[PDB]
Amino acid sequence: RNICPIKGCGKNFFSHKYLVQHQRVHSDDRPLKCPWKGCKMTFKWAWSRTEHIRVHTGARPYVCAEPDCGQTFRFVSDFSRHKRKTGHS
DNA sequence: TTCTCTGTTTTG
DNA sequence: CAAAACAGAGA
Ligand SMILES: [Mg+2]
Ligand SMILES: [Zn+2]
Ligand SMILES: [Zn+2]
Ligand SMILES: [Zn+2]
């Protein structure tokens, strides 16, 4: 059990290493930056930054493999929701 | 609806 | 292992 000390947080984590990284939730630094030209967005989590760049490019890399489905997604959560909903993969 | 945040899982 | 990615929730 690795429990967060702070405030009215106190949730526990599968791991101690993640408990340490979790602390960025209760700090205000947003050290990751958007590499797009003159976008001022900043982040704490690298995955947010990765998905975010697709708003700039328009990409839709998540492609449903179900025969004849044909659907594509910009964001992994959406792709997971659709599999969940539908049963594809 | 689009998208970001984050705890856990997968990949390398 | 650490980094990348997922899956879920929900702003
Ligand atoms: Mg920039
Ligand atoms: Zn906490
Ligand atoms: Zn940006
Ligand atoms: Zn599908």
Residue numbers in the entry: 1265 to 1353
What does the study report here?
The RELATIVE OF EARLY FLOWERING 6 protein (REF6/JMJ12), a Jumonji C (JmjC) domain—containing histone demethylase, specifically demethylates H3K27me3 at its target loci. REF6 has intrinsic DNA-binding ability and specifically recognizes its target sequence (CTCTGYTY motif, Y = T or C) via tandem zinc-finger (ZnF) domains located at its C-terminus. ZnF domains adopt the canonical ββα fold, with a small β-sheet packed against a helix in a globular structure, and wrap more than one turn of the DNA double helix, interacting with DNA in the major groove with a classic α-helix. Structural analysis demonstrates that CHG methylation is unfavorable for REF6 binding and attenuates REF6-binding affinity.
Although the overall structures of the REF6 ZnF domains were similar between complexes with methylated or unmethylated DNA oligos, there are minor conformational changes when DNA strands carrying the methyl-group.
